[PDB]
């Protein structure tokens, strides 16, 4: 976190249900979108930090 990494993600299908139903995550807190709804939407860009 001295120099955290940003990956731009663009031009694709994605499936967030694959992430959300993974047992791997101790928190999955989504703020302006509910984690169920992500598969129904499309975005101009996504940034993974």
């Amino acid at each position: 976190v001295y120099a955290w990494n940003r990956k731009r993600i663009s031009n694709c299908v994605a499936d967030y249900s694959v992430l959300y139903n993974s047992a791997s995550f101790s928190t999955f807190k989504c703020y302006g979108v509910s984690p169920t709804k992500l598969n129904d939407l499309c975005f101009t860009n996504v940034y993974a930090d």
Binding site: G32, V33, S34, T36, K37, D40, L41
Partner: protein, 50 residues
């Protein structure tokens, strides 16, 4: 310019209706002023709060 009394009865209704229409664009503290954004982005238990 003599008929200002009658032209004001037109103008005050035009102001009142345009003001009432423009208030549909205001957030009032919600994430969006467009109701379908809330319904598409938020699941039922959260969407009611907006």
């Amino acid at each position: 310019s003599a008929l200002g009394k009658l032209q004001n009865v037109v103008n005050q209704n035009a102001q009142a209706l345009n003001t009432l229409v423009k208030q549909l664009s205001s957030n009032f503290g919600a994430i969006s002023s467009v109701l379908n954004d809330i319904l598409s982005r938020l699941d039922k238990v959260e969407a009611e709060v907006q």
